[PDB]
Amino acid sequence: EIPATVAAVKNPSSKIIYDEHNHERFPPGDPSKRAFAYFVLTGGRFVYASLIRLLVLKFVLSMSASKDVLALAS
Amino acid sequence: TIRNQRFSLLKEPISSTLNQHLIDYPTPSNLSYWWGFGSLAGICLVIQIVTGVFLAMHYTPHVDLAFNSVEHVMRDVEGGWLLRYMHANGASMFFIVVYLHIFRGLYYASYSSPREFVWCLGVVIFLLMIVTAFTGYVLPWGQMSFWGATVITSLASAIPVVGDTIVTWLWGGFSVDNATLNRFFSLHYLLPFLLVGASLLHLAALHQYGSNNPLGVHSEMDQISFYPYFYVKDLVGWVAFAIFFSIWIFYAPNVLGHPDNYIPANPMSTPPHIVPEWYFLPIYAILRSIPDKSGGVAAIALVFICLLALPFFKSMYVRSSSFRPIYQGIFWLLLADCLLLGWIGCQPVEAPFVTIGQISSFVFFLFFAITPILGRVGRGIPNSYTTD
Amino acid sequence: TIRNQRFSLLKEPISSTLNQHLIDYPTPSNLSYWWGFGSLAGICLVIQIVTGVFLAMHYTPHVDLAFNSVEHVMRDVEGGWLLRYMHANGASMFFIVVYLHIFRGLYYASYSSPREFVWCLGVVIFLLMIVTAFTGYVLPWGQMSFWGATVITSLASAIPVVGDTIVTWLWGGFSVDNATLNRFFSLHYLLPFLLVGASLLHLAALHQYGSNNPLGVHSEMDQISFYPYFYVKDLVGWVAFAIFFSIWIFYAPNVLGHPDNYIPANPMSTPPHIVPEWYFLPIYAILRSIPDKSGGVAAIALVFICLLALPFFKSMYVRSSSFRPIYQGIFWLLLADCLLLGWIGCQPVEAPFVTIGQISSFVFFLFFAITPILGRVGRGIPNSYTTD
Amino acid sequence: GGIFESLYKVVMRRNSVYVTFVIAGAFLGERAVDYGIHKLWEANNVGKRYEDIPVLGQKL
Amino acid sequence: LFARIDAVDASTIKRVANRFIYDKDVAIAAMGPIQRLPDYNWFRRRTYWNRY
Amino acid sequence: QPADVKAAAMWGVAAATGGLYLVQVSILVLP
Amino acid sequence: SFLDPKKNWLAAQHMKSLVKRLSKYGLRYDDLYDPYYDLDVKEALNRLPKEVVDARHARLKRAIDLSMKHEYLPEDLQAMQTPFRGYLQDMLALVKRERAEREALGGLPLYQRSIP
Amino acid sequence: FLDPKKNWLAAQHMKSLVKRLSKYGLRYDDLYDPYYDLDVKEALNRLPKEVVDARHARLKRAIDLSMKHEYLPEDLQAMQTPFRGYLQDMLALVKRERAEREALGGLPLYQRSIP
Numbered sequence A: 001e002i003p004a005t006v007a008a009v010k011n012p013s014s015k016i017i018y019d020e021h022n023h024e025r026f027p028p029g030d031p032s033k034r035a036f037a038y039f040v041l042t043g044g045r046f047v048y049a050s051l052i053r054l055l056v057l058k059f060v061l062s063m064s065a066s067k068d069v070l071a072l073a074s
Numbered sequence B, C: 001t002i003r004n005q006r007f008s009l010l011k012e013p014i015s016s017t018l019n020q021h022l023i024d025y026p027t028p029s030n031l032s033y034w035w036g037f038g039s040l041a042g043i044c045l046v047i048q049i050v051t052g053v054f055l056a057m058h059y060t061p062h063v064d065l066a067f068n069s070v071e072h073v074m075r076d077v078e079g080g081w082l083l084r085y086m087h088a089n090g091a092s093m094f095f096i097v098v099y100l101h102i103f104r105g106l107y108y109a110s111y112s113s114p115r116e117f118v119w120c121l122g123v124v125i126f127l128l129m130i131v132t133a134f135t136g137y138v139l140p141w142g143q144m145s146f147w148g149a150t151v152i153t154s155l156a157s158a159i160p161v162v163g164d165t166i167v168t169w170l171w172g173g174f175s176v177d178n179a180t181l182n183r184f185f186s187l188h189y190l191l192p193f194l195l196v197g198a199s200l201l202h203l204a205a206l207h208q209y210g211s212n213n214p215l216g217v218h219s220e221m222d223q224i225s226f227y228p229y230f231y232v233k234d235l236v237g238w239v240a241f242a243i244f245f246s247i248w249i250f251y252a253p254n255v256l257g258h259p260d261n262y263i264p265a266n267p268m269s270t271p272p273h274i275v276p277e278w279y280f281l282p283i284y285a286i287l288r289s290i291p292d293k294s295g296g297v298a299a300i301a302l303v304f305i306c307l308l309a310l311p312f313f314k315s316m317y318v319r320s321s322s323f324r325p326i327y328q329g330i331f332w333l334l335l336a337d338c339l340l341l342g343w344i345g346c347q348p349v350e351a352p353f354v355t356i357g358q359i360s361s362f363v364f365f366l367f368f369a370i371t372p373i374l375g376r377v378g379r380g381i382p383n384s385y386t387t388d
Numbered sequence D: 001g002g003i004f005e006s007l008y009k010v011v012m013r014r015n016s017v018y019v020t021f022v023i024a025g026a027f028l029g030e031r032a033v034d035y036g037i038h039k040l041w042e043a044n045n046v047g048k049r050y051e052d053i054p055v056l057g058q059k060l
Numbered sequence E: 001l002f003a004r005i006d007a008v009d010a011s012t013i014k015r016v017a018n019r020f021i022y023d024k025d026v027a028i029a030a031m032g033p034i035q036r037l038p039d040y041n042w043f044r045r046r047t048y049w050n051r052y
Numbered sequence F: 001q002p003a004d005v006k007a008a009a010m011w012g013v014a015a016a017t018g019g020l021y022l023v024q025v026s027i028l029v030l031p
Numbered sequence G: 001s002f003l004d005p006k007k008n009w010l011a012a013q014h015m016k017s018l019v020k021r022l023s024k025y026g027l028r029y030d031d032l033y034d035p036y037y038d039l040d041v042k043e044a045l046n047r048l049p050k051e052v053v054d055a056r057h058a059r060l061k062r063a064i065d066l067s068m069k070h071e072y073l074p075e076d077l078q079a080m081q082t083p084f085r086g087y088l089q090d091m092l093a094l095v096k097r098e099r100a101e102r103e104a105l106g107g108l109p110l111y112q113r114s115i116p
Numbered sequence H: 001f002l003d004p005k006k007n008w009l010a011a012q013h014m015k016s017l018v019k020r021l022s023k024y025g026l027r028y029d030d031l032y033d034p035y036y037d038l039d040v041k042e043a044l045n046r047l048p049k050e051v052v053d054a055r056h057a058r059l060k061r062a063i064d065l066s067m068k069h070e071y072l073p074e075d076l077q078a079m080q081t082p083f084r085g086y087l088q089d090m091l092a093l094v095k096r097e098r099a100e101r102e103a104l105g106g107l108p109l110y111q112r113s114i115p
């Protein structure tokens, strides 16, 4: 009654079975959608760069001059 | 593996400590989204520090200029309204995520051995947060700020031997005045850096013993590195928190506030409803519920005594409450009681709120007085349900 | 050794890092007192932080109240003159101790490998000290304070394309008024904590690569633990420093300053003699000596480039100056040049001081330009002096 | 699939090109979102803006 | 065979590697005390450089 | 080395674009 | 008192719920004892046979994997689960008894918890 | 290059170095820190154990004297060989091997770790 791991090691098979509970497999012959994930991440990076730019500008220009002195200068 | 020549710039001594403790620190592979709150309180602290520095470039701690200076930041400074709303609602967010942090710890019994030092440093951090938020809230010098400062600092004269002496020393005079405002400003500036240090010690202790997990079991069998598996999880947490914070900044910037603070402080008039911020409300409620104000201060001390005494209880070998139905129900009752007690704090001190707050405090302390009993009784479970 | 039961508290995980890095760190057995100067600089930083906090409990960052607030600290606050004199003269002693630190490093060539990172972090630390002391000196708001702020901030206009924009943005409103005062108070309060972080990184890098010794030789043969052997030496240094600093505080507290800072700032008239504090005088003298203010700013940048470029030299095999007569003489000439340069900066631009400064700064850069030549020739030495 | 792979081979072979693309896309998306939100604002609250009051220049 | 072999230069090697190695999927088979061998995402990320 | 030069030039272009996007000197750029 | 599920309906319900939970995650009640928790469990696990300890580690790894995947054991093995079939309580009791005797008469602790 | 036996200044420099080095009982090669160059490290690894151990003994003696604030007695100062080097040839050989290895497409056998 050889153990499960020993039987798996000693008998390699091409009919590999994964979990497929919350991640469904692609059919065995199919190209990998590698580009689509990269473009999704690209949109996210668009957003992240825009947010970083916003925050830096907001702080720096908060340290800038104020409407009070701008109106005072005549 | 002889390091004759360089392989990876991550493993070089310049980046080796960061490599280990951030990129390569092993964490259990089953952590849920409840650990992102620990990851997120630090972000809230950083936001508070940065916005506070840029605000302090515009605030004047005098008693005749504090309110007008805050309004100057509101109106004249470009983007100043963003800074001030960020600082205020960010204090609120900091406390929200820290409460979620604490309550996850309570649910999963993360305070249990061997993380007693983690929990105790967390309690010290909580003290620092409370003091910082209070002394900072006194800064804008509104009616609520002035009178809350007066009431709370005057309620430090309950100590028997010294009392009035400590109160006079703390006030810098005979009443909350310019000296107290300046002192509070300096202390408010200083304390967050001690808070950063305490957070670093907190993280160092946790990394000494490693993080818990929902099952509460030993988890050195199935572990994965922090980056990138938990970096992306915390990223989802951060973006959700950013959406929440953006809602609370741009659409409801004063909902969490109290309108009476927009009145310049007037020591000759008292507002009809003196109450602290929403995140001091449970503590205030316990303090008011216990009569004989010295007894109230004693109860407030006893709250922290109980919090520090939590990790040093009896056997209670099972820790996660997923396998503890009675402790699960007790935890839910505790959370409900804390929410109810927070509601009570904002209410007046008339009936029936006095009785509702007196029962709520008793339930809150009964939670701590019942858990050791649960552990003692449950110590003998396997001998009773065994299938031999 | 299996740590089954705990022997010593110092080897427990709570005090293990502290144990290693403070008590058990092996140190060369032949260190003189200048390593004590390094520790003394650390103590001076702590003194500055504490006295600054307690001073900021009484200082109003407004233009109409800063000077009278400082006079409040001197006259009304209980033992406030002690706090203010300690802060000012402690800035002075901090710079004295850091200068002795730097010059010991230069004499014993401690910047050489493998302590390039230690030297570079030291240069960053020196920049932070300069900025912090400058913005702090702006705070009392006197004649020298206001006019020095004006001049040193307005020389930032030398940048080719964005000079004027940076000057106006840093000024906040076409002058050095209240906005600049608040800005400088916030920055002066913030910077010392970054300075503490930089000091900790400095010490960490040094502790990585051990510590040099008066011989410059490998020193892993005879090494002793830091405590108690060097704690007592540092203690002797600290007590002597305390006597020096007490001489300065109590008997001659205004010698290291200028009398023009006791006049309230009046942007209409201009004091006849505008100079920075004594510890900025060498840099001021270099900048003033080289005309064409763009050239002056470039020259200051060049000074810091040379300071950062010392560690990365080619041969430089023999380290200590005890076995380098030529470099010993060069170092003493450089020190005399630095003292003369500092003295020149307090003098007017009338002749002959222009010629003397234009020679002294050139000699400074000459020192920084003739160390590699000595290193190459010394690398050539051994195959010529052989006695056989 | 084909379109995504084509744009991938266009703009995802060097990270410098990718960073330039990310920055340009962030800028263009920011400006487009600005324009869209402004059009929604104009559509929603019409007749309230400053340059709409009938007597804007008659206080003299 | 020799002509085909020495008709391979540096540019040909780069082109073939970019066809076969740059950002492709690896297949790993390991056994033994491999509790320190990096996981799949590690190798899959190492198949490209972000500096270039 | 030529490939390194091309990569450095492209990275400089990317950094210049990033700085331009951060500062937004469209008004300043007269030439 | 000593309340067992035979003489207590509430204890019967409690045991039923615990059995349901442990069967869902497929791990015995003794597997919940953390060696880092007590350091007496550490010694008791050091004294147990390697087959038993390896089975404990395998069950814990399976439970953690199921927890990450957000799923439960399939109903077959769930019906094949045997919680409360203890393997550690006797050894833990022996270790604690030995420690109590050693502490009671003279003696230094054989092992101690670091600070912290 | 006119250093030895033809330069009065170079003769004076040699005299001073001999005085100082013999005063501490060191040699010139002992001034070469292994941590400084990482070629001195390889040379010291390749040198015979007796030579390396003598170097370490001389270094320990010099550090002891530097701590005590005193010099060698006149007898041991007389019995000194400050310039009887032992490291220059091995160091030059190591440098030459490094030179050819970098000359024709080779990885360094050791690199300095970034601190």
Ligand code: HEM
Residues within 6 Å of the ligand: B045, B048, B049, B050, B051, B052, B053, B055, B056, B059, B070, B084, B087, B088, B091, B094, B129, B132, B133, B134, B136, B137, B138, B139, B140, B188, B189, B190, B192, B193
């Ligand atoms: C060094 C970092 C910090 C600085 C410099 C700082 C500075 C300031 C300043 C100048 C104000 C008054 C301006 C205003 O009222 O909006 C303020 C207010 C406040 N701060 Fe901070 N702060 C810092 C960190 C924090 C932290 C960490 C917290 C939270 C724990 C906090 C909580 C508050 C609160 C609640 C107010 C009152 C806001 C209001 O009601 O207007 N601050 N802070």
Ligand code: HEM
Residues within 6 Å of the ligand: B034, B035, B036, B037, B038, B039, B041, B042, B045, B098, B101, B102, B105, B108, B110, B111, B115, B118, B119, B120, B121, B122, B123, B125, B126, B199, B202, B203, B206, B210, B211, B212, B213
């Ligand atoms: C400044 C506020 C705080 C910060 C920044 C902070 C930070 C962290 C971080 C980064 C972690 C590791 C990640 C995680 O496990 O979620 C953590 C864990 C933890 N913290 Fe905090 N914390 C704070 C406040 C508190 C407080 C007030 C307590 C309780 C008194 C506390 C108790 C804990 C516990 C018990 C853990 C272990 C979590 C586990 O079970 O693995 N923390 N904290």
Ligand code: HEM
Residues within 6 Å of the ligand: C034, C035, C036, C037, C038, C039, C041, C042, C045, C098, C101, C102, C105, C110, C111, C115, C118, C119, C120, C121, C122, C123, C125, C126, C199, C202, C203, C206, C211, C212, C213
């Ligand atoms: C905040 C001011 C500074 C502090 C607190 C500080 C602190 C220290 C400490 C504690 C040490 C180790 C003990 C010692 O060797 O004296 C040290 C060493 C050292 N420091 Fe600093 N330092 C400061 C500024 C500087 C500066 C400005 C430089 C030069 C740029 C510098 C360069 C060095 C060097 C080269 C060493 C190596 C010591 C040796 O070779 O034996 N330090 N410093």
Ligand code: HEM
Residues within 6 Å of the ligand: C045, C048, C049, C050, C051, C052, C053, C055, C056, C059, C070, C084, C087, C088, C090, C091, C092, C094, C129, C132, C133, C134, C136, C137, C138, C139, C140, C188, C189, C190, C192, C193
């Ligand atoms: C966080 C810590 C610090 C705080 C809160 C602080 C705060 C202050 C305050 C409020 C003043 C004005 C009071 C007065 O006029 O005497 C001041 C002055 C000054 N500070 Fe600091 N300071 C700190 C650290 C430092 C450090 C590290 C230095 C650098 C040596 C420094 C250098 C100065 C100087 C030169 C002055 C002007 C002395 C004078 O009044 O004539 N400060 N500081």
